[PDB]
């Protein structure tokens, strides 16, 4: 019901190319039962360096477009911030957005980022009074099968996010993400996940799987847990409330 990680702004990153694509992506998200989407387009040194004024501009146009989808679809502003050290000054001085202007910022790393680097970056952001929500923790080799490390990040004041796509069963044929599904399944079993979110980009390779994932978590982990990960926690994040 509340999706805190999405790529829905046209012509700013690897998401929609056009207004028409953004609308179609919103529509599919709405169809699946999502009622609030936080826009978190990429901020990444050397990869996604679209200027902030453009991202904000196209964002506001997507927010308008969302009215054509449904009147109760709320679009919030945010950023998926790949960590490089310049990001610290940007956050301190609010030149890079948090999630709906809350304390929470969405932070990502590389698949092969060493734990010590992860731990260090997140420690420094915490020192800014900003709470990291760690994007797609199933991506990071450093956390694979590592309850102790994830726990250590959570215990110092981080929250964790897993992509809906990796919540799904590994497919009998054509499975290209088996290792990330196994990782997400590990974290869920260990009860190490605060949030499941879309990371949606398009309707081909990367659609939302929020309805499918919600049902799967309901079946395997109970409805209350599904509510927690897909509604209650995301809602606290959007409303700048402590979890
Ligand atoms: Fe990412
Ligand atoms: Fe993303």
Tab-separated table of C-alpha atoms and ligand atoms in Angstrom:
chain	number	residue	atom	x	y	z
A	1	UNK	CA	0.000	0.000	0.000
A	2	UNK	CA	2.904	2.478	0.537
A	3	UNK	CA	5.921	2.255	-1.784
A	4	UNK	CA	8.991	4.184	-0.608
A	5	UNK	CA	11.418	3.365	-3.456
A	6	UNK	CA	10.503	4.149	-7.068
A	7	UNK	CA	11.817	5.460	-10.348
A	8	UNK	CA	8.806	7.321	-11.746
A	9	UNK	CA	10.216	10.674	-12.940
A	10	UNK	CA	10.628	10.891	-16.728
A	11	UNK	CA	13.972	11.775	-18.359
A	12	UNK	CA	16.133	11.977	-15.223
A	13	UNK	CA	17.585	8.478	-14.641
A	14	UNK	CA	17.095	4.920	-15.818
A	15	UNK	CA	13.286	5.135	-15.359
A	16	UNK	CA	10.530	6.471	-17.646
A	17	UNK	CA	11.600	8.236	-20.810
A	18	UNK	CA	8.380	10.225	-21.202
A	19	UNK	CA	5.306	11.572	-19.366
A	20	UNK	CA	3.277	8.777	-20.956
A	21	UNK	CA	5.556	6.102	-19.497
A	22	UNK	CA	5.414	7.686	-16.024
A	23	UNK	CA	1.613	7.612	-16.140
A	24	UNK	CA	1.495	3.967	-17.195
A	25	UNK	CA	3.866	3.051	-14.354
A	26	UNK	CA	1.789	4.955	-11.793
A	27	UNK	CA	-1.334	3.249	-13.140
A	28	UNK	CA	0.111	-0.248	-12.720
A	29	UNK	CA	1.291	0.611	-9.232
A	30	UNK	CA	-2.197	1.882	-8.339
A	31	UNK	CA	-3.780	-1.251	-9.837
A	32	UNK	CA	-1.694	-3.365	-7.483
A	33	UNK	CA	-3.082	-1.495	-4.478
A	34	UNK	CA	-0.388	1.097	-3.821
A	35	UNK	CA	-1.795	4.421	-2.634
A	36	UNK	CA	1.364	6.394	-1.764
A	37	UNK	CA	4.522	6.365	-3.879
A	38	UNK	CA	7.723	8.152	-2.849
A	39	UNK	CA	9.711	9.294	-5.875
A	40	UNK	CA	13.337	8.275	-5.263
A	41	UNK	CA	15.113	8.932	-8.568
A	42	UNK	CA	18.880	8.182	-8.655
A	43	UNK	CA	21.444	10.511	-7.214
A	44	UNK	CA	24.744	8.855	-8.132
A	45	UNK	CA	28.173	10.420	-8.747
A	46	UNK	CA	29.435	9.413	-12.171
A	47	UNK	CA	26.261	7.660	-13.206
A	48	UNK	CA	23.090	9.677	-12.524
A	49	UNK	CA	24.041	13.331	-12.333
A	50	UNK	CA	20.822	15.002	-13.514
A	51	UNK	CA	20.526	18.380	-11.877
A	52	UNK	CA	18.275	18.668	-8.831
A	53	UNK	CA	16.189	21.462	-10.373
A	54	UNK	CA	15.303	19.279	-13.340
A	55	UNK	CA	14.428	16.278	-11.184
A	56	UNK	CA	12.194	18.503	-9.051
A	57	UNK	CA	10.621	19.992	-12.155
A	58	UNK	CA	9.730	16.700	-13.812
A	59	UNK	CA	8.633	15.367	-10.400
A	60	UNK	CA	5.994	18.074	-10.018
A	61	UNK	CA	4.720	17.206	-13.485
A	62	UNK	CA	4.416	13.524	-12.468
A	63	UNK	CA	2.543	14.590	-9.343
A	64	UNK	CA	0.034	16.364	-11.597
A	65	UNK	CA	-0.144	13.308	-13.840
A	66	UNK	CA	-1.010	11.210	-10.789
A	67	UNK	CA	-4.270	13.137	-10.562
A	68	UNK	CA	-5.223	11.579	-13.897
A	69	UNK	CA	-4.662	8.147	-12.379
A	70	UNK	CA	-6.670	8.507	-9.185
A	71	UNK	CA	-7.559	11.286	-6.772
A	72	UNK	CA	-6.314	9.373	-3.700
A	73	UNK	CA	-2.860	8.536	-5.121
A	74	UNK	CA	-0.311	10.532	-3.136
A	75	UNK	CA	3.097	11.217	-4.700
A	76	UNK	CA	5.913	12.185	-2.310
A	77	UNK	CA	9.407	13.487	-3.115
A	78	UNK	CA	12.654	11.673	-2.202
A	79	UNK	CA	15.923	10.387	-3.713
A	80	UNK	CA	17.767	7.106	-4.021
A	81	UNK	CA	21.212	8.270	-2.977
A	82	UNK	CA	24.179	6.138	-4.005
A	83	UNK	CA	26.838	6.754	-1.356
A	84	UNK	CA	29.962	8.704	-2.253
A	85	UNK	CA	31.460	11.071	0.277
A	86	UNK	CA	30.184	14.319	-1.327
A	87	UNK	CA	26.703	13.099	-0.386
A	88	UNK	CA	27.347	14.007	3.263
A	89	UNK	CA	27.648	17.752	2.580
A	90	UNK	CA	24.647	17.561	0.242
A	91	UNK	CA	22.447	16.019	2.959
A	92	UNK	CA	23.703	18.315	5.712
A	93	UNK	CA	22.781	21.336	3.587
A	94	UNK	CA	19.541	19.786	2.295
A	95	UNK	CA	20.613	19.972	-1.342
A	96	UNK	CA	19.583	16.332	-1.757
A	97	UNK	CA	16.151	15.211	-0.592
A	98	UNK	CA	15.132	12.897	2.213
A	99	UNK	CA	12.015	10.753	1.935
A	100	UNK	CA	9.054	13.174	2.016
A	101	UNK	CA	11.251	15.633	3.891
A	102	UNK	CA	11.517	13.248	6.843
A	103	UNK	CA	14.565	12.210	8.814
A	104	UNK	CA	14.852	9.134	6.604
A	105	UNK	CA	17.101	9.029	3.552
A	106	UNK	CA	17.335	6.115	1.118
A	107	UNK	CA	20.979	5.094	0.666
A	108	UNK	CA	22.452	2.510	-1.729
A	109	UNK	CA	25.852	0.962	-2.305
A	110	UNK	CA	27.453	-1.340	-4.875
A	111	UNK	CA	27.016	-5.101	-4.918
A	112	UNK	CA	30.648	-5.484	-3.915
A	113	UNK	CA	31.046	-2.634	-1.413
A	114	UNK	CA	33.021	-3.900	1.598
A	115	UNK	CA	31.128	-4.056	4.876
A	116	UNK	CA	33.531	-1.631	6.532
A	117	UNK	CA	32.637	0.943	3.865
A	118	UNK	CA	28.930	0.317	4.324
A	119	UNK	CA	29.224	0.580	8.106
A	120	UNK	CA	31.361	3.733	7.857
A	121	UNK	CA	29.101	5.639	5.410
A	122	UNK	CA	25.982	4.845	7.410
A	123	UNK	CA	27.681	5.831	10.664
A	124	UNK	CA	28.554	9.226	9.181
A	125	UNK	CA	25.013	9.841	7.894
A	126	UNK	CA	23.656	8.953	11.317
A	127	UNK	CA	25.966	11.595	12.751
A	128	UNK	CA	24.130	14.111	10.541
A	129	UNK	CA	20.908	13.301	12.408
A	130	UNK	CA	19.695	11.441	9.307
A	131	UNK	CA	18.289	7.895	9.543
A	132	UNK	CA	19.446	5.654	6.681
A	133	UNK	CA	16.941	3.340	5.031
A	134	UNK	CA	19.266	0.931	3.236
A	135	UNK	CA	18.091	0.236	-0.259
A	136	UNK	CA	17.690	-3.373	-1.389
A	137	UNK	CA	19.935	-5.058	1.178
A	138	UNK	CA	19.733	-8.284	-0.865
A	139	UNK	CA	22.086	-6.571	-3.346
A	140	UNK	CA	25.107	-6.472	-1.032
A	141	UNK	CA	27.586	-9.349	-1.002
A	142	UNK	CA	28.809	-8.097	2.372
A	143	UNK	CA	25.479	-8.873	4.006
A	144	UNK	CA	24.807	-12.193	2.386
A	145	UNK	CA	23.824	-14.762	5.016
A	146	UNK	CA	25.081	-12.295	7.608
A	147	UNK	CA	22.526	-11.771	10.342
A	148	UNK	CA	25.242	-10.389	12.590
A	149	UNK	CA	26.189	-7.570	10.198
A	150	UNK	CA	22.600	-6.560	9.352
A	151	UNK	CA	21.729	-6.609	13.002
A	152	UNK	CA	24.675	-4.378	13.728
A	153	UNK	CA	23.485	-1.862	11.130
A	154	UNK	CA	19.918	-1.971	12.467
A	155	UNK	CA	21.144	-1.640	16.059
A	156	UNK	CA	23.067	1.514	15.314
A	157	UNK	CA	19.889	3.090	13.904
A	158	UNK	CA	19.437	1.937	10.303
A	159	UNK	CA	16.363	0.423	8.655
A	160	UNK	CA	16.333	-2.125	5.828
A	161	UNK	CA	14.505	-2.351	2.554
A	162	UNK	CA	14.029	-5.318	0.223
A	163	UNK	CA	12.754	-5.133	-3.386
A	164	UNK	CA	9.326	-6.779	-4.017
A	165	UNK	CA	10.765	-8.593	-7.040
A	166	UNK	CA	13.154	-10.571	-4.876
A	167	UNK	CA	10.420	-11.642	-2.505
A	168	UNK	CA	8.924	-13.849	-5.244
A	169	UNK	CA	9.650	-17.582	-5.669
A	170	UNK	CA	12.573	-18.464	-7.915
A	171	UNK	CA	11.046	-19.447	-11.261
A	172	UNK	CA	11.372	-22.921	-12.811
A	173	UNK	CA	12.565	-21.416	-16.088
A	174	UNK	CA	14.414	-18.234	-17.004
A	175	UNK	CA	15.383	-17.218	-13.468
A	176	UNK	CA	18.147	-14.595	-13.569
A	177	UNK	CA	17.976	-13.328	-9.972
A	178	UNK	CA	18.090	-16.517	-7.938
A	179	UNK	CA	20.804	-15.346	-5.568
A	180	UNK	CA	18.968	-12.177	-4.663
A	181	UNK	CA	15.734	-14.029	-4.029
A	182	UNK	CA	17.570	-16.440	-1.755
A	183	UNK	CA	19.155	-13.482	0.068
A	184	UNK	CA	15.806	-11.714	0.514
A	185	UNK	CA	14.296	-14.966	1.777
A	186	UNK	CA	17.091	-15.241	4.341
A	187	UNK	CA	16.542	-11.722	5.641
A	188	UNK	CA	12.761	-12.177	5.927
A	189	UNK	CA	13.115	-15.478	7.740
A	190	UNK	CA	15.524	-13.811	10.097
A	191	UNK	CA	13.032	-10.962	10.557
A	192	UNK	CA	15.601	-8.408	9.359
A	193	UNK	CA	13.422	-6.482	6.919
A	194	UNK	CA	11.625	-3.252	7.797
A	195	UNK	CA	10.149	-2.432	4.400
A	196	UNK	CA	9.312	-3.978	1.088
A	197	UNK	CA	9.234	-1.497	-1.789
A	198	UNK	CA	8.934	-1.465	-5.602
A	199	UNK	CA	12.152	-0.145	-7.033
A	200	UNK	CA	9.944	0.084	-10.127
A	201	UNK	CA	11.389	1.532	-13.300
A	202	UNK	CA	9.324	0.449	-16.272
A	203	UNK	CA	6.783	-2.092	-17.310
A	204	UNK	CA	9.151	-4.429	-19.010
A	205	UNK	CA	12.235	-5.522	-17.073
A	206	UNK	CA	11.390	-3.809	-13.841
A	207	UNK	CA	7.740	-3.476	-12.927
A	208	UNK	CA	6.421	-3.279	-9.384
A	209	UNK	CA	5.691	-6.663	-7.810
A	210	UNK	CA	4.046	-5.216	-4.701
A	211	UNK	CA	0.742	-7.129	-4.906
A	212	UNK	CA	2.498	-10.434	-5.656
A	213	UNK	CA	5.037	-9.856	-2.856
A	214	UNK	CA	2.395	-8.767	-0.331
A	215	UNK	CA	0.489	-12.017	-0.891
A	216	UNK	CA	3.629	-14.127	-0.665
A	217	UNK	CA	4.645	-12.510	2.648
A	218	UNK	CA	1.098	-12.923	3.944
A	219	UNK	CA	1.222	-16.653	3.131
A	220	UNK	CA	4.712	-17.271	4.497
A	221	UNK	CA	5.045	-14.774	7.345
A	222	UNK	CA	1.473	-13.842	8.291
A	223	UNK	CA	-0.783	-10.909	7.432
A	224	UNK	CA	0.423	-8.762	10.322
A	225	UNK	CA	3.994	-8.936	8.983
A	226	UNK	CA	2.826	-8.049	5.480
A	227	UNK	CA	0.982	-5.059	6.956
A	228	UNK	CA	4.123	-4.032	8.846
A	229	UNK	CA	6.471	-4.218	5.873
A	230	UNK	CA	4.172	-2.888	3.147
A	231	UNK	CA	2.012	-0.391	5.082
A	232	UNK	CA	2.842	0.444	8.685
A	233	UNK	CA	6.617	0.952	8.488
A	234	UNK	CA	6.542	2.790	5.155
A	235	UNK	CA	3.795	5.012	6.615
A	236	UNK	CA	5.937	5.899	9.609
A	237	UNK	CA	8.790	6.746	7.238
A	238	UNK	CA	6.556	8.967	5.085
A	239	UNK	CA	5.141	10.665	8.223
A	240	UNK	CA	8.611	11.134	9.768
A	241	UNK	CA	7.732	8.935	12.738
A	242	UNK	CA	10.100	6.686	14.670
A	243	UNK	CA	9.918	2.943	14.109
B	1	LIG	FE1	19.355	0.800	-6.225
B	2	LIG	FE1	16.293	2.039	-7.127
